[PDB]
Amino acid sequence: QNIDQPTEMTATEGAIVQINCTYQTSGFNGLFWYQQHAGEAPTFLSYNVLDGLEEKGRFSSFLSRSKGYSYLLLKELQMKDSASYLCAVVDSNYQLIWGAGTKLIIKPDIQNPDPAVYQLRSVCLFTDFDSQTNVSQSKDSDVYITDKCVLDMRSMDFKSNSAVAWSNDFACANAFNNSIIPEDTFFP
Amino acid sequence: GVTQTPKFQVLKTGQSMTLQCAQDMNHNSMYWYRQDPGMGLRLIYYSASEGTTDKGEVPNGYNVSRLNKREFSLRLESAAPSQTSVYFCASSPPGGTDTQYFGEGSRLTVLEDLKNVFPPEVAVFEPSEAEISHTQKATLVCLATGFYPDHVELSWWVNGKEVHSGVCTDPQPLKEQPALNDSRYALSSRLRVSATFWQNPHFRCQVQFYGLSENDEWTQDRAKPVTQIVSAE
Amino acid sequence: MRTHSLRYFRLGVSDPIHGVPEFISVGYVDSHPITTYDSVTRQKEPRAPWMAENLAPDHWERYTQLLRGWQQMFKVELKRLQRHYNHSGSHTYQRMIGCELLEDGSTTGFLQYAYDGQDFLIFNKDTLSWLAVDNVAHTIKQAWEANQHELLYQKNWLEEECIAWLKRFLEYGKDTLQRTEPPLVRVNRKETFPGVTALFCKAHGFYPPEIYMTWMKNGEEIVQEIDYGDILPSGDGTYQAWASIELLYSCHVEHSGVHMVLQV
Amino acid sequence: IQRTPKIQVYSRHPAENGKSNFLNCYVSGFHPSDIEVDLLKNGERIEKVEHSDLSFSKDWSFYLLYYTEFTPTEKDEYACRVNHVTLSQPKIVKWD
Ligand SMILES: *[C@@H](C)/C=N/c1c(NC[C@H](O)[C@H](O)[C@H](O)CO)[nH]c(=O)[nH]c1=O
């Protein structure tokens, strides 16, 4: 019948996140959790059929048959945990009814923020701002603005945020005027 | 595990198409699902065992063949725009609660005509001199623009080897004409490295576009928008 | 309520003689067959009208596909036992799954396998283990116990899912299953061999099949031997039975909360 | 280990001559499943005979019910003829 999950969840890197799943079904023959990375196949995470919490590394899945509820708990959150988490329930007719999924977004812990807008050679780069700032879409039809994306320089243990803006009467000093950019933003 | 083909396909409204799926795990039960934004995987057709098939939740516009113990193919007879989706093949033993093992997926796009199919234009933008001096780091930006449909795979290659550290490509592309239905796409990615790494005399941004094939008929004066690799260095 | 039970059986025969299905699977609610599937029909069909009238085509369609897959596994599992035993020719494999919903509200569940009509493996839901009767059973046991997910799934099916189905089917066929048809009991007396009087207590026309009958001397259980008759289907959904002794005697009959005494 | 069938021939209602009844033959406790049941009136097989589908026991053996409408007479001699693997020749069990 019905499987219900949050559409999207956001937690900070290193923290704990609980993805909830409630079902209204005709019978119960177990509950699955699958991980699905953007543009990849879903891969199994857990299967629960009896009441309890089963641990498997940093991921632990819990079930309450009476409460018709389950959770997937993610500990010591990593950037790599950013994926869609699919809840699925086997009913009385052994049909797998899948939930729409929960997109998990991981805000990186930005140690020393350094907001700035650099011009790269026709393209503008808003970078090094802390995970708390949001990048708004373009106003004009000729200016194209992308949303924030987290990069990891593994070697240097350095995570950063970035948004790109490009167009063909356009400048970097005006490029992100629709977005609430930090007052300390560096404009060279 | 589970092998499905093709990863991407462009079809004109009315064209026939067969997705293939094979598994060498000795699985009896096989499944064909369709993943669409905002909803959980929807079963099209399933095969409980060799010698049997049955309609799933959304079987209209499709047929299936369980050729043997390993093969289960999905047939789109007259492709419709409503069939633009991502198809997953799955397999499991026949208990009824046995874990399902999934194929890589199959991006299928059904268009009224192929006159808007366009490969990307790929441009690399060298790091800002102000970034290098202020952060002691260098960000290279890449741009795949004007492509249609959304069948691309953007990757960086540093000194012949592909990289993943300091790489970040947009999860969803950008509609270059948001008010248009046939809107073409734009996509960015960044590659960040130490200033000293950028200062040593390479860096290539590679985009794999998945378009038409030899079997696809081409009338237009412009170049056949085939499956190809567009690059910038 | 009274004690009702839900169970399904599977039968697999290797090298079957012409006109014998390779696979058969039949479901019961107490003494009543509710469902049927075999390798010839390849369809799960009802065996009771209250099953047909209350279960939508969707059920029959889904369970046919599951049974088609379950059929094939049965054939494989039997080929694997025969290989382990170094057996050739025709051999049987059986399964019995089910649950009991007692009068007091408590429940039982069971899952057992046989090979050549003899106990092979017996599931213990309380410890999640398989009791193996020999080394071939032991090899299978080690493999089945290696999938803990499956054992928990069966414990849940037997404890939770099975009982729900039984309660569902019990409402579907209440007019049949929960009915009481009292027995018609008679006592017959006859001088058999010279000096031997034989008293018979014959009961018939009763539903449910469970009936208690005994002979008592002066209201105290016979010190002697009683011969017992099998509870038998009359053919009309009612049962018949008997109890007899040699020669103050009385026949006692307990059936569905009513106690009968027939003095001689 | 093959178990030979237990054959029980009886009437639905206490029998009385000249009164319509039903002659039953309960074949049970046999293993394997392959069985052949026929009801006979003076040695000849009764063509109009209804029966239950093969049934299953907790002990792994099988059972069947074969029946037919009949009016018992002093002259008429009824029987149940069963054949199983355990039987060297079909077993004819006469009704009492
Ligand atoms: C119609 C409901 C028929 N069911 C059926 C079953 N069902 C019991 C249970 O779901 C199953 O045996 C296992 O747990 C599956 O791995 N069992 C059976 O053997 N025969 C049937 O027709």
Side-chain angles (χ1 to χ4, degrees), chain A residues 28 49 65 92-95, chain C residues 62-63 153 156-157 161:
Chain A
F28 179 78
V49 73
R65 288 170 290 171
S92 71
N93 284 327
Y94 296 95
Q95 187 194 334
Chain C
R62 298 179 163 279
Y63 276 94
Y153 148 69
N156 176 80
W157 196 86
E161 284 298 294

Side-chain angles (χ1 to χ4, degrees), chain B residues 79-101:
Chain B
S82 58
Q83 305 178 298
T84 291
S85 200
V86 184
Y87 300 83
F88 289 95
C89 186
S91 77
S92 57
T97 72
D98 307 319
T99 302
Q100 277 182 33
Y101 289 83

Side-chain angles (χ1 to χ4, degrees), chain A residues 126-129 132-133 141:
Chain A
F126 187 32
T127 202
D128 308 346
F129 51 86
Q132 274 65 229
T133 99
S141 197

Side-chain angles (χ1 to χ4, degrees), chain A residues 94, chain B residues 95, chain C residues 8 10 25 35 44 59 63 67 70 95 97 153-154 157:
Chain A
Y94 296 95
Chain C
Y8 309 84
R10 284 179 213 171
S25 186
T35 77
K44 193 225 182 149
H59 176 85
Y63 276 94
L67 277 162
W70 293 338
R95 187 204 211 229
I97 195 156
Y153 148 69
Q154 298 284 8
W157 196 86

Side-chain angles (χ1 to χ4, degrees), chain C residues 216 218-219 222-223 226-232:
Chain C
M216 274 173 107
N218 316 288
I222 207 146
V223 54
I226 316 180
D227 194 5
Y228 291 104
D230 287 13
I231 289 142
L232 298 176

